[PDB]
Amino acid sequence: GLCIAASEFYKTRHNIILSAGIFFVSAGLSNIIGIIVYISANAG
Amino acid sequence: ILVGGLGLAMLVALIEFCYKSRLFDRGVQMLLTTVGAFAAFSLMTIAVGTDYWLYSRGVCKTKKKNEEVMTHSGLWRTCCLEGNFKGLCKQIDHFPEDADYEADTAEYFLRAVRASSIFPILSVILLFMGGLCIAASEFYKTRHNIILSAGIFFVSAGLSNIIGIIVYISANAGKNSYSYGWSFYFGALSFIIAEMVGVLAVHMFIDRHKQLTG
Amino acid sequence: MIKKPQKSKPGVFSFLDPLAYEIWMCIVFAYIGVSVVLFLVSRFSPYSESTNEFGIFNSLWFSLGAFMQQGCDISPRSLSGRIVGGVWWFFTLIIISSYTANLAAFLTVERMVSPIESAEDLSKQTEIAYGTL
Amino acid sequence: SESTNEFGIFNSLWFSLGAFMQQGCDISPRSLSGRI
Amino acid sequence: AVLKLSEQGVLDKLKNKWWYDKGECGAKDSGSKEKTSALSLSNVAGVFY
C-alpha cells in the first residue's frame, strides 16, 4: 500500500511498480498459511 | 512444502533478471572433468576397500558368542567393535542351514552373486578403464571417437554401482535398528559423479564434432 | 426389545463426504494462488515480449488440466516455470489419490453396530439396565 | 543439417519427471532404442 | 533350599541355559496384526532388474 502511491511522486523509475505487486501476492501467502495453522490449532 | 516451494520458485525467477541486467571456459572443462573423474575414481575404491559400511549388532567369532556384539560391518571383514575383543575382523560367506533350498536356484544364484564384489568391483573396472582413456586425448589424439567410448564406461560403472547397492541391501534382510557407516555413502556419492562426468564427455565429443563439422 | 438407534441418511452431496468441509475450502484457496504465481513468472520481460503462451486465465486452465488427469496443451519451459509445476503435480498426485482411498471406504459398509446382543453384556456391563414384568 | 533431437539434458530430466507423474509431456522419444 | 535359588533367580539362569542359551532352530515367527508396515525393498526386487 505504500508503493502504489509512489507511481506519481518520484516516478518514471517504473520498476518499483513491479516490486509493489510482489508484496500483495506474498501477503496472500502469509494469509493462507495462518489460516491453516489456526485450523490446525482447533483440533490441536 | 507446497507453499514453501512457491517463494522458492519466485526467488530464482528474480535472480535471472538481474543477472541478465548487466559451460564457461571450454578447454578447462576438459581439465574440469579430470579432477571430477579422478576423485570419483578415488571414492569408489575407498568404499570398496572398507571393512565398515553399516553399523549393526551381531557377533565377532563363534564356535565370543556371548549375546551380541555391535559390529563395524562391511563387505568382507565383518569386524566388530565394543566387546571383550575389539577389532577382530571375521571373514564371512554363505552358510548351509536346514535343507538349503537348492530348488530356490533364484536364491542360490542370488547367494552366489552376493558373496562377491562382482558389480562393485566391476564398478571400479570401467571407472578405471574410463580413467585410462581420458588421458589418451592428447597422446595419439585426433582419432576423437575414442573420447566417446570413454564416457560409456563411466555411466556403465554407475550401473554396476547401483545394482551392487541393491543386492547388498537385499542381502541384509536376506527390530534391530541398524545404522550406516559414512563409508557406505561413498559408493552412492561416487555414483552421482560417475554419471556427472560422462555427460560432460558427450558435450566435449559433440563440440569437437561441431568443430569437426565447422 | 431395545430402542431403534437412529441411523443417519446420506445427503445429496454424499460424494463430497470423504473429505472434510475445510479442505474443500482450503484447496480452492491453494488452487488460485498456485495459478497466479505461474502467471507471475509467465510474463516477466524476456531480456519479443510475445513469447510465452501462458495467458491470464490460460494459466488457470493449465492448473486445472494438470489437477484433474486430462493433460494440457503446452508445457512450461523456464527453470522457474517448470519448478512450480512439478510441485503442483506432486500436490495433486498425493491429494486426490488419497481421496479415492477414503472414497472406497464409504462404499464398503454402512452397518450401525447397534450394541452387543444375545445380550451377555447385561451380565457384564453396568451401563444399560434391564427388567421384566 | 542435423538439429533433430529436441531432448537436451534438461528436458530429458523433465520428461523423466512427468512420466513418473501422471501428467505427460509433448516431447516423446520418436526414435528406436530410445523409444523402448 | 528351593526358596533361596528362586529368590536368587538361579533357576532362571538355568532356564536361560537349557531353553534359551540353546536357541537353535532359528525360525522366530511370531506374527503381528499391524498392517501399517512399509513394504520391503526386496518385495520390489526384480522390478529394478
| HEC-encoded secondary structure of chain C | CCCCCCCCCCCCCCCCCCCCHHHHHHHHHHHHHHHHHHHHHHCCCCCCCCCCCCCCCHHHHHHHHHHCCCCCCCCCCCHHHHHCHHHHHHHHHHHHHHHHHHHHHHCCCCCCCCCCCCCCHHHHCCCCCCCCC
Q: How far off is chain D from C1, nearest CA to CA, in Å?
A: 55
Please list every residue in chain D whose beta carbon sits closer than 8 Å to the beta carbon of residue C90: 21
- Cβ contacts from C onto D, under 8 A: 21
List the one residue out of B49, B43, B47, B30 whose CA is nearest residue B151: B30
Count the Cβ atoms, other than its own, within 10 Å of residue C129.
6
Please list every residue in chain C whose beta carbon sits closer than 8 Å to the beta carbon of residue B10: 37, 40-41, 80
Q: φ and ψ at C93, to 5 degrees?
A: -70, -45
Q: φ and ψ at B141, to 5 degrees?
A: -100, -170
Q: φ and ψ at B146, to 5 degrees?
A: -75, -20
- Expt. technique: cryo-EM
Contacts of C89 (CB under 8 A, 6+ apart): C66, D17, D18, D21, D22, D23
Please list every residue in chain C whose beta carbon sits closer than 8 Å to the beta carbon of residue D22: 69, 89, 93
Q: In terms of CA atoms, which chain C residue is nearest residue B21? A: C47
* Residue type (1 letter), C90: F
Rg (CA), chain A: 16
Burial letters for C37-58: b for 16+ Cβ neighbours within 10 Å, e otherwise? Answer: bbbbbbebeeeeeeebebeeeb
Q: Among B10, B17, B20, select the one facing C37 at the smallest CB separation.
A: B10
Cβ <8 Å between C80 and B17: no
Sign of CA dihedral B191, B193, B197, B200: positive
Q: How far off is chain B from E6, nearest CA to CA, in Å?
A: 24
List the one residue out of B11, B1, B48, B173 whose CA is nearest residue C40: B11
List the one residue out of B67, B97, B99 whose CA is nearest residue B82: B67
Distance CA B94, CA B113 (A): 11
Sign of CA dihedral A7, A11, A17, A23: negative
β-bridge mates for residue B77, sequence order: B91
Distance CA C85, CA C64 (A): 12
Distance CA B194, CA B44 (A): 9
Distance CA C110, CA C99 (A): 19
Q: Mutate which of D16, D20, D21, D23 to test chain C, going by most C C-beta atoms within 10 A?
A: D23
List the one residue out of B91, B107, B85, B99 whose CA is nearest residue B174: B107
> Is any Cβ of chain A less than 8 angstroms from the Cβ of C22?
yes
**Cell numbers at C29, concatenated:** 484457496
Distance in angstroms between the alpha carbons of the first and the last residue of chain D: 26
- In 3-state terms chain D splits into helix, strand, coil percentages (rounded to 5) of 35, 0, 65
C-alpha separations of E38 from C69, C90, C94, E31 in Å = 27, 20, 17, 15
List the one residue out of B116, B58, B53, B115 whose CA is nearest residue B88: B58
**Cell numbers at C68, concatenated:** 484433474
DSSP-assigned letter for residue B99: S
Please list every residue in chain E whose beta carbon sits closer than 8 Å to the beta carbon of residue B97: 26
3-state secondary structure of E41: coil
Q: How far is CA B51 from the centre of its chain?
A: 16
Burial letters for B15-28: b for 16+ Cβ neighbours within 10 Å, e otherwise? Answer: eeeeeeeeeeeeee
Please list every residue in chain C whose beta carbon sits closer than 8 Å to the beta carbon of residue B16: 79-80
Contacts of B191 (CB under 8 A, 6+ apart): B158, B161, B162, B165
Distance CA B47, CA B50 (A): 5
List the one residue out of C85, C114, C83 whose CA is nearest residue C7: C114
